[PDB]
Design a protein around this motif. Sequence first.
Motif, PDB file in Angstrom:
ATOM      1  N   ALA A 184     101.290  46.469  45.189  1.00 31.77           N
ATOM      2  CA  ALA A 184      99.489  45.948  44.236  1.00 31.77           C
ATOM      3  C   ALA A 184      99.065  46.078  42.568  1.00 31.77           C
ATOM      4  CB  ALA A 184      98.738  47.484  44.632  1.00 31.77           C
ATOM      5  N   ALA A 185      98.639  44.376  42.757  1.00 31.15           N
ATOM      6  CA  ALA A 185      98.056  44.298  41.821  1.00 31.15           C
ATOM      7  C   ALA A 185      98.261  45.778  40.437  1.00 31.15           C
ATOM      8  CB  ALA A 185      97.127  43.693  41.990  1.00 31.15           C
ATOM      9  N   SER A 186      98.337  44.957  39.857  1.00 34.97           N
ATOM     10  CA  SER A 186      97.983  45.758  37.943  1.00 34.97           C
ATOM     11  C   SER A 186      96.806  44.906  37.682  1.00 34.97           C
ATOM     12  CB  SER A 186      99.030  46.479  36.758  1.00 34.97           C
ATOM     13  OG  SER A 186     100.365  46.550  37.373  1.00 34.97           O
ATOM     14  N   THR A 187      96.737  43.823  37.522  1.00 33.41           N
ATOM     15  CA  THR A 187      95.858  43.297  36.543  1.00 33.41           C
ATOM     16  C   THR A 187      95.524  41.932  37.279  1.00 33.41           C
ATOM     17  OG1 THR A 187      97.869  41.937  35.563  1.00 33.41           O
ATOM     18  CG2 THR A 187      97.214  43.618  34.581  1.00 33.41           C
ATOM     19  N   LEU A 188      94.402  41.699  37.496  1.00 26.11           N
ATOM     20  CA  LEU A 188      93.637  40.855  38.132  1.00 26.11           C
ATOM     21  C   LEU A 188      94.037  39.249  38.175  1.00 26.11           C
ATOM     22  CD1 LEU A 188      90.803  42.495  37.915  1.00 26.11           C
ATOM     23  CD2 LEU A 188      89.683  40.797  37.219  1.00 26.11           C
ATOM     24  N   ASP A 189      94.937  38.720  36.647  1.00 28.57           N
ATOM     25  CA  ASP A 189      96.393  37.936  36.832  1.00 28.57           C
ATOM     26  C   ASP A 189      96.737  37.884  38.112  1.00 28.57           C
ATOM     27  OD1 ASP A 189      95.528  37.126  33.998  1.00 28.57           O
ATOM     28  OD2 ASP A 189      96.775  38.291  33.560  1.00 28.57           O
ATOM     29  N   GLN A 190      97.359  39.199  38.706  1.00 32.24           N
ATOM     30  CA  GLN A 190      98.632  39.130  39.695  1.00 32.24           C
ATOM     31  C   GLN A 190      97.689  38.876  41.507  1.00 32.24           C
ATOM     32  OE1 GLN A 190     100.087  42.615  38.156  1.00 32.24           O
ATOM     33  NE2 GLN A 190     101.329  41.607  37.998  1.00 32.24           N
ATOM     34  N   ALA A 204      81.426  45.856  34.155  1.00 33.61           N
ATOM     35  CA  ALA A 204      81.083  46.176  33.029  1.00 33.61           C
ATOM     36  C   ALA A 204      82.303  46.271  31.570  1.00 33.61           C
ATOM     37  CB  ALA A 204      81.633  47.767  33.216  1.00 33.61           C
ATOM     38  N   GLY A 205      82.663  45.043  31.739  1.00 32.79           N
ATOM     39  CA  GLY A 205      84.502  44.722  31.313  1.00 32.79           C
ATOM     40  C   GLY A 205      85.149  45.169  30.903  1.00 32.79           C
ATOM     41  N   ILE A 206      85.763  46.460  31.846  1.00 33.62           N
ATOM     42  CA  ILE A 206      86.319  46.759  32.445  1.00 33.62           C
ATOM     43  C   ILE A 206      88.206  45.902  32.019  1.00 33.62           C
ATOM     44  CG2 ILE A 206      88.396  48.634  33.048  1.00 33.62           C
ATOM     45  CD1 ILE A 206      85.692  49.896  32.472  1.00 33.62           C
ATOM     46  N   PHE A 207      88.253  44.573  32.997  1.00 25.54           N
ATOM     47  CA  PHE A 207      89.090  43.685  32.796  1.00 25.54           C
ATOM     48  C   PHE A 207      89.133  42.753  32.051  1.00 25.54           C
ATOM     49  CE2 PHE A 207      87.843  44.828  37.700  1.00 25.54           C
ATOM     50  CZ  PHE A 207      88.595  45.560  38.104  1.00 25.54           C
ATOM     51  N   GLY A 208      87.978  42.618  31.113  1.00 19.74           N
ATOM     52  CA  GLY A 208      88.046  41.438  29.841  1.00 19.74           C
ATOM     53  C   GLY A 208      86.858  41.183  30.753  1.00 19.74           C
ATOM     54  N   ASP A 209      86.970  39.705  30.295  1.00 14.52           N
ATOM     55  CA  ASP A 209      86.109  38.346  30.308  1.00 14.52           C
ATOM     56  C   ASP A 209      86.687  37.865  31.790  1.00 14.52           C
ATOM     57  OD1 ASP A 209      87.766  37.270  27.870  1.00 14.52           O
ATOM     58  OD2 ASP A 209      86.950  35.807  28.831  1.00 14.52           O
ATOM     59  N   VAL A 210      86.428  37.521  32.422  1.00 16.92           N
ATOM     60  CA  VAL A 210      86.654  36.846  33.690  1.00 16.92           C
ATOM     61  C   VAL A 210      85.645  35.688  34.545  1.00 16.92           C
ATOM     62  CG1 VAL A 210      87.404  37.628  36.038  1.00 16.92           C
ATOM     63  CG2 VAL A 210      87.654  39.378  34.402  1.00 16.92           C
ATOM     64  N   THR A 211      85.870  34.772  34.579  1.00 18.46           N
ATOM     65  CA  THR A 211      85.614  32.915  34.761  1.00 18.46           C
ATOM     66  C   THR A 211      85.355  33.162  36.189  1.00 18.46           C
ATOM     67  OG1 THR A 211      87.146  31.860  33.808  1.00 18.46           O
ATOM     68  CG2 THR A 211      85.560  32.365  32.677  1.00 18.46           C
ATOM     69  N   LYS A 212      86.757  33.689  36.733  1.00 17.55           N
ATOM     70  CA  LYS A 212      87.137  33.786  38.494  1.00 17.55           C
ATOM     71  C   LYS A 212      85.729  34.271  39.374  1.00 17.55           C
ATOM     72  CE  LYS A 212      91.392  32.880  37.261  1.00 17.55           C
ATOM     73  NZ  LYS A 212      92.873  33.119  38.705  1.00 17.55           N
TER      74      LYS A 212
END
Length: 343
Positions: free
Chosen positions: A19-25, A129-137
């Motif tokens: 499973a992914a740890s971050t949105l990148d993955q 909320a911004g838990i993931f950082g900024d996410v433009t996707k």
Amino acid sequence: VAHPSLGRGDGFPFLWDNAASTLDQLNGTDTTIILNGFNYLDRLSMFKTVLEGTRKYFDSFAPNNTANIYWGFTIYLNWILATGRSADPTGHTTCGLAHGDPMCLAEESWWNCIKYNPAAIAFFAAKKAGIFGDVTKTIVLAKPKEANSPYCSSEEECQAAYPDVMATYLDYFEYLMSLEKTGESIDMDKAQQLLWKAHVTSMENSIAVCKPRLKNYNIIERQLDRDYLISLLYFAATNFPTNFIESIKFVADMPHRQLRFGDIAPFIPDMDMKKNNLLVVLHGFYTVHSLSGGSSLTHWRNLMESPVSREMARDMVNLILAGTPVEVQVELAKLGIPTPVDY
């Protein structure tokens, strides 16, 4: 194959490392992230990414992020998979069966129905909320096939169909984000109360729309489902922790397979005493609730306004988890619930 309580073998969910740890993955393209809400691994990622994003708030309490209170529904996802409760119970598709796609979580499964939002809507609230950082996707969710489905497939659609659910999960993540600006440490009781309020709001918002799916199961397993949902409302008011250790303790005491005609707790011969006992207890909360017209839950919430009452109620929960055969109505009375009588 997934183990009901042990997951992959040590408590962590089946396929935890995949499973992914971050949105990148996560899969997708350069402008989109793709998630299938009806796939075990993607649902596991929806949990794991929030667990990694919130790691820093719970770091000083224990290793391996095990004090994080987001484990609750994470561990229950593994359990619903391991026990076949996420598979298609109707026989109309092979979704979730060993000869079909075993990762597929069926639309017609009652467990999938009630547990979908605490994964998906919570994931959206975390992102906002911004838990993931900024996410433009842009998040793109696989769509259900049923028309007018209880399962929402986008940020806006989920917001519009379940606004209170989105809002309460948002309150939790916004409170975590505020710890970065106030330069304060986390209030565990307050954080737990916030997460529980989202979970409860989700359960209450899903109860009527998921109800028809109860009919896809025999009457014994079906009554367990009701037993569980009602009991959860009582457990949540106590502010019982939903961390790794406590969550493992709960799923260990849950039935390892779906129930069938013939099963009568506490005399189910392929289950240990702790499981048989929990089943009696779950039904005990259902009976108190039912005989009182739901009024016991209202009383319980008012009594659970006091932190000392909450601490005493958590002690009763620990006894229950240890397998101690307590009578629910008698314990509720001891804590100040008038107990009903059958007419």
